[PDB]
From Swiss-Prot:
Changing Y153F: Shows a surprising 41% residual proteolytic activity on a substrate peptide. Total loss of proteolytic activity. Binds 1 zinc ion per subunit. Zn(2+) binds at H117, H121, Y153, E160. Belongs to the peptidase M34 family. Pro-Pro endopeptidase subfamily. Pfam families: ATLF. The record marks D110, H117 as: Interacts with substrate peptide. One of its GO terms (cellular component) is extracellular region. InterPro entries: Anthrax_toxin_lethal/edema_N/C, ATLF-like_dom, MetalloPept_cat_dom_sf. Its EC number is 3.4.24.89. This is Pro-Pro endopeptidase. Residues 10-195 form the ATLF-like domain.
C-alpha cells in the first residue's frame, strides 16, 4: 500500500505489538511490524479494540512463562519428527506470539510468512467469529483449499487455508497475484471481506 496508509497502520500496531525483554534484532522486529502494517486497517483496529496483543519473542516459544506449559509437547502431526512446541516459532488464535527472525517460510514453519499467518488466525477467531468455519468459506475451501499446496494440511483444515490465504493476500503483490490466479473465489472473498 501507499506509504501513508502504512504509517497509519504502524501507529495502530504500536498499541498491539509487544516487544520482548531479552535481546533481539531490532531491525528485523521492525520489519515484522512493517509486514503486519500491510493488513487492512479495519482488521488491525478491530484487534486493538479487543485488546489482542501480538507478542514478539526473543527466544523459544516455550521459554515464555505463559507458554511454558507447552514444553516437551508434541504438536499434532509432528510425531516421530523429534520436534516439539519448543521448536514452533509462532501461534495464533486467542493470542499471538511470534519468534523474531522466523518470518520466512521454512524457519520452523510452513507458512509463506509467520506473522501474517498467525495474525490471520487471531483475526479469524477474534474479529470474524471463526469465519473460516462458515458455510460460505467451507464451499470455497472444498473447491480451492488445496491450491496453495500442503494438501494434507491446508487442504484438510479450513482454518489453516484461511490463515495461509490471508497471508498471501496481504504479504506483497506477488503473493497477492498468485492467490488470485490459484484461488480466485478465495481472493474475491477476502477482497469483499475488507470492503
Ligand atoms: Zn496455522
Amino acid at each position: 500500500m501507499d506509504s501513508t496508509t502504512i504509517q497509519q497502520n504502524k501507529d495502530t500496531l504500536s498499541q498491539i505489538v509487544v516487544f520482548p525483554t531479552g535481546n533481539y534484532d531490532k531491525n528485523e522486529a521492525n520489519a515484522m511490524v512493517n509486514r503486519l502494517a500491510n493488513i487492512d486497517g479495519k482488521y488491525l483496529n478491530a484487534l486493538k479494540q479487543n485488546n489482542l496483543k501480538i507478542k514478539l519473542l526473543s527466544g523459544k516459544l516455550t521459554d515464555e512463562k505463559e507458554y511454558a506449559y507447552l514444553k516437551g509437547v508434541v504438536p499434532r502431526g509432528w510425531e516421530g519428527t523429534g520436534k516439539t512446541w519448543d521448536d514452533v516459532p509462532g501461534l495464533g488464535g486467542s493470542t499471538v506470539a511470534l519468534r523474531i527472525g522466523f518470518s520466512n517460510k521454512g524457519k520452523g514453519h510452513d507458512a509463506i510468512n509467520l506473522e501474517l499467518h498467525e495474525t490471520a488466525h487471531a483475526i479469524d477467531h477474534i474479529v470474524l467469529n471463526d469465519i473460516s468455519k462458515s458455510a460460505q468459506f467451507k464451499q470455497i475451501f472444498a473447491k480451492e483449499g488445496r491450491s496453495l499446496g500442503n494438501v494434507n494440511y491446508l487442504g484438510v483444515y479450513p482454518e489453516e487455508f484461511f490463515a495461509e490465504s490471508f497471508a498471501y493476500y496481504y504479504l506483497n503483490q506477488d503473493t497477492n497475484s498468485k492467490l488470485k490466479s490459484a484461488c480466485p473465489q478465495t481472493y474475491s472473498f477476502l477482497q469483499n471481506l475488507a470492503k
